Amino acid sequence: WKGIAIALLVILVICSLIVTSVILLTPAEDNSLSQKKKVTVEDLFSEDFKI
Amino acid sequence: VTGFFIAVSVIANVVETVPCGSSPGHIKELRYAVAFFCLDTACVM
What we know:
The structure is cut from a larger assembly and holds chains A and B.
Chain A: H1 3-25, H2 41-44
Chain B: H1 2-15, H2 36-44
Helix pairs in contact in B: 1-2
PDB class: membrane protein
Keywords: membrane protein
Entry title: CryoEM structure of human Kv4.2-DPP6S complex
């Protein structure tokens, strides 16, 4: 046999490529960025905090 | 091919709540790939 096996694995490769392309293209995953940076000593002596 | 895709569908359903692939494991920063859904859809059709 083994012709059945090679045809099968070819079809599996094609279907896997299709499904992984869908997996790559479909979702967003773009949460951008959140949270604000904490306070460090360099911030104190910057011109930003001058009263 | 039908047997193989039934196997992947059932294994995906099993994995659906694996902590690495589910809500836990990432709370400090956020992976929880929802693409599982798509796989289900494909198998179903």
